[PDB]
């Protein structure tokens, strides 16, 4: 038996601020780590209504939920039960910038995330502060090892109202609490989607599908 069950629940709390607006979001959900699928129900507990596009937050809301082929070592599942943390810089094409940190632990059949999210320098009339984003496009994150830890780069793109795209570069460092078998360079294909939401995004249901592969 692995400590990572075929079905794992999720509980999380995010505290953060975007362009000075503070907020707290809590989440509950469930997913299938070996299928690479998960669903989360998120609730704005402080700072409602959010004055910025909810989409900039959603990738901060766990690479344990990735379908890993057997010939690629799975850094994330191996990291449990002790867990792992990641930090991420998100640099937007209009020089908006976000930095997030998340600590991921486990108890029983449930992951626990504590997430800190800070963003600023977004133009007040840009698509983030004016809530003109529609969705993230599906993406491909390039995973590589450097300094003995696992890192990932992905070029991201938000579809805008009117058909434009608004671009972002993600740089992530992932660090397990213990030493684990490190993989070779590979890729992770992602698809993240807000399945439903209420008017102001105080309630959001969020889905990701993710799968690792070599080339």
């Amino acid at each position, epitope marked *: 038996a692995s400590v990572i069950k075929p079905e794992m629940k999720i509980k999380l709390r995010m505290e*953060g*601020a*975007v*362009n*000075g*607006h*503070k907020f707290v979001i809590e989440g509950e959900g469930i997913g299938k780590p070996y299928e690479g699928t998960q669903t989360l129900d998120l609730t704005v507990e402080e700072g409602a209504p959010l004055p910025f596009s909810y989409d900039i937050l959603t990738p901060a809301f766990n690479r344990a939920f990735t379908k890993y082929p057997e010939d690629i070592p799975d850094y994330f599942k191996q990291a449990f039960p002790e867990g792992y*943390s990641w*930090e*991420r*810089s998100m*640099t937007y094409e209009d*020089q908006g*910038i976000c*930095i997030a*940190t998340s600590d991921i632990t486990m108890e029983g059949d449930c992951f626990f995330y504590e997430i*800190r999210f*800070d*963003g*600023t*320098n977004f133009p007040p009339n840009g698509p983030v502060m004016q809530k003109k984003t529609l969705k993230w496009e599906p993406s491909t994150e390039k995973m590589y090892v450097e300094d003995g830890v696992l890192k990932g780069d992905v070029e991201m793109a938000l579809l805008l109202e009117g058909g434009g795209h608004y671009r972002c570069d993600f*740089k*992530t*460092t992932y*660090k397990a609490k213990k030493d684990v078998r490190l993989p070779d360079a590979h890729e992770v294909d992602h698809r993240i989607e807000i399945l439903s939401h209420d008017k102001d995004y105080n309630k959001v249901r969020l889905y990701e599908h993710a799968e690792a592969r070599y080339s």
Partner: nanobody, 116 residues
Framework: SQVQLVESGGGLVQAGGSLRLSCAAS????????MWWYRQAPGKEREWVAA????????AYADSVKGRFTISRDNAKNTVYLQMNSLKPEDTAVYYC????????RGQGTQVTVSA
């Protein structure tokens, strides 16, 4: 209000010169908030300069300073360093740091003047 922020290292340097700023915070748990550099010149509005994550694993820079400035952080203290190389007159300003975003906690700043 044991929370305090103190920037050090500013000064008068000539164009093409170097300076190493630092920003020391007290009153917070070590390495559990991101830290952010800003600067503000005479009649100009405040500019974001650089940022570093809680644990120091990731960094970010404004386009105007990328490749010239480097941000780093003590793993055991809330102390951040901004190595400023290849300085330009446009870099003249008061530089300050903030813990996290939107906290209201700000330091007095440190004056950087770059003489053409």
């Amino acid at each position: 209000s044991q929370v305090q922020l103190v920037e050090s290292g500013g000064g008068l340097v000539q164009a093409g010169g170097s300076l190493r700023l630092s920003c020391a915070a007290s009153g917070f748990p070590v390495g559990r908030a991101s830290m952010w550099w800003y600067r503000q010149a005479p009649g100009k509005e405040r500019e974001w300069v650089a940022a570093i994550s809680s644990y120091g694993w990731v960094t970010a820079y404004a386009d105007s300073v990328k490749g010239r400035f480097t941000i780093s952080r003590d793993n055991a203290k809330n102390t951040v360093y901004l190595q400023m190389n290849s300085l330009k007159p446009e870099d003249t300003a008061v530089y300050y740091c903030e813990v996290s975003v939107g906290t209201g906690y700000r330091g007095q700043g440190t004056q950087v003047t770059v003489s053409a």
